[PDB]
Structure formats: C-alpha cells, structure tokens
Design a protein around this ligand. Structure first.
Ligand SMILES: C[C@@H](C(=O)O)c1ccc(-c2ccccc2)c(F)c1
Ligand SMILES: C[C@@H](C(=O)O)c1ccc(-c2ccccc2)c(F)c1
Length: 133
C-alpha cells in the first residue's frame, strides 16, 4: 500500500545530485550547500490527501496533493510548474511540467529503504533514505 511510504525518512546515500541540479540551472553556491545537506522527508496522509515535507539546514519544502489530481507547485527554485503524483507499479511518481520541460521524482521501497530517482533530461540522481522512528 501507499501506506508503506508514510513516516520520517533520513538521507543515507546520494548519487549524481549535482548533475541533476546543474540540469535545472541551479547556481554553484546552492549546489555546494545542497551536496552536503542530509534532508529529512516526511510523508503523511489524511484520507486521500498526502503531504510531503522535506526539511534540512538549507531549506524546507512542503506540498499537499490528492493522488492522480494535478496541482500547481512553486518549487524551491521558483519554477512555476504543473504537477501530478500517482502510484505506478507500486512507486510514488511525482511529475513536474513547465515550459515543455519535465522532471520526474520517483520513490520506491526496496528492503525497507526509500529510493528516490530524480530525472531531468539525461541527468539521473539516485538518493536513498532510511526510516526514522
Ligand atoms: C527530496 C529532496 C531530497 O532529495 O531529499 C529534494 C529537495 C529539493 C530538490 C530540488 C528542488 C529544486 C531544484 C533542485 C532540486 C530536490 F531535487 C530534492
Ligand atoms: C536537497 C534540499 C536540501 O538541502 O534541503 C534542497 C532544497 C532546496 C534547494 C534549492 C535549489 C535551488 C534554489 C534554492 C533552493 C536545493 F537545491 C536542495
């Protein structure tokens, strides 16, 4: 169930995040700070509304959405985007569209860990989170 995603997750591994951030035009000073943060992802539900928070020493984000229903998102870097989150093959797929561009944030559970794959053009970043109590 989507319920297996719920809770508090701490970053334990990251691959190619700098490439992903460069692909979105994130400036070098922000990429430097973000390369060292170890954010917390919190996923909560109330009926069919999910809330996904990310917390770090650099930045906070939060979105709420109904699965399979489009929402407007102002991203952390002030992209004004059209978004949707869905379950697809048991993975939580978050698609953002703006200016004919797309990025996907795909979350899945493997051996109790949460694996986030971030794709924008050719850039693919894999980030691994472990559950907190
Ligand atoms: C989910 C969280 C994380 O990976 O821990 C996160 C936070 C912000 C971003 C982000 C947001 C705006 C531009 C570039 C990257 C991200 F890709 C992932
Ligand atoms: C990964 C996460 C974090 O460190 O908390 C994060 C959050 C915000 C950003 C971001 C990205 C571009 C502009 C402003 C902020 C990021 F690159 C990474």
């Amino acid at each position: 169930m989507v319920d297996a995603f719920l809770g508090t997750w701490k970053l334990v591994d990251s691959k190619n995040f700098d490439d992903y951030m460069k692909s979105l035009g994130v400036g070098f000073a922000t990429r430097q700070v973000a390369s060292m943060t170890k954010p917390t992802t919190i996923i909560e539900k109330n009926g069919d509304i999910l809330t996904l928070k990310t917390h770090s020493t650099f930045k906070n984000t939060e979105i709420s959405f109904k699965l399979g229903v489009e929402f407007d998102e102002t991203t952390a870097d002030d992209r004004k985007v059209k978004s949707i989150v869905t379950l697809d093959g048991g993975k939580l797929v978050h698609l953002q569209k703006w200016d004919g561009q797309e990025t996907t944030l795909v979350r899945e559970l493997i051996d109790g860990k949460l694996i986030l794959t971030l794709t924008h053009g050719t850039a693919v970043c894999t980030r691994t989170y472990e559950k907190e109590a």
